[PDB]
Symmetry: none
Subunit: 130 residues, 2 copies
């Protein structure tokens, strides 16, 4: 069922995730964006159930895209991914009602857990990032 | 199914919440503690699925009771409740492996989600209390 958007600037990273997702039985389609600006462009014309957004992206960060989604009040869960703690990003994301904020390099099994979790209306934070 | 304990020092809030919880079909029964000590005494006697603990209680606080529950390695899920974001609390609750740390003033609908959430081993934290 899920319509997923994946925003990630590092091309290998982006490909690995979109493919792992595309091959999940629970997934219907997976849009791609190289940076924060493409993600917004796509979200301006297309419908998404979950946006998986990396934080450090060129032009628009994942945090800035999250903030736009909320300002535009879209029916979209937002899963922000990151690798480094290195933040104030947490407060900022939590202040933006991010549906989850989790490690980027986790198992596709773990990512699907997150995806369902936010679909059902709950939230998930990778402790390491707290 | 749920065997619940509620520890709340304000007597009208304790009756309100306990009566509301009892009217829920998912909730089986609710023990009741007027402070942190009554809570522990009750915890070491009866089985309890989830304890809903006020933080600001006389004698022993919610946080103390949480720490005791863990030092006993009880198989109880802990929901801590409060109204004030008080420096140091969220952390201390989270280092003790609290299952939820949420606002007291919420719908029973909301509270029930919290209850289910912690049974399934997940976490919930009210944003207004995170730090
Ligand atoms: Mg990046
Ligand atoms: Mg109190």
């Amino acid at each position: 069922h899920m319509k997923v958007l994946v925003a990630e600037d590092q091309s290998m990273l982006r490909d690995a995730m979109c493919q792992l997702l595309t091959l999940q039985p629970d997934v219907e389609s997976v849009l791609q964006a190289k940076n924060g600006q493409e993600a917004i462009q796509l979200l301006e014309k297309e419908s998404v159930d979950i946006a998986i957004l990396d934080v450090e992206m060129p032009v628009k960060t994942g945090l800035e895209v999250l903030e736009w989604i909320r300002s535009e009040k879209l029916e979209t869960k937002v899963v922000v991914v990151t690798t480094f703690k290195r933040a104030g990003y947490f407060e900022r994301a939590v202040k933006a009602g991010v549906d989850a904020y989790v490690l980027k390099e986790r198992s596709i099994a773990d990512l699907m857990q997150t995806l369902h979790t936010v679909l059902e209306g709950r939230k998930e934070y990778s402790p390491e990032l707290m």
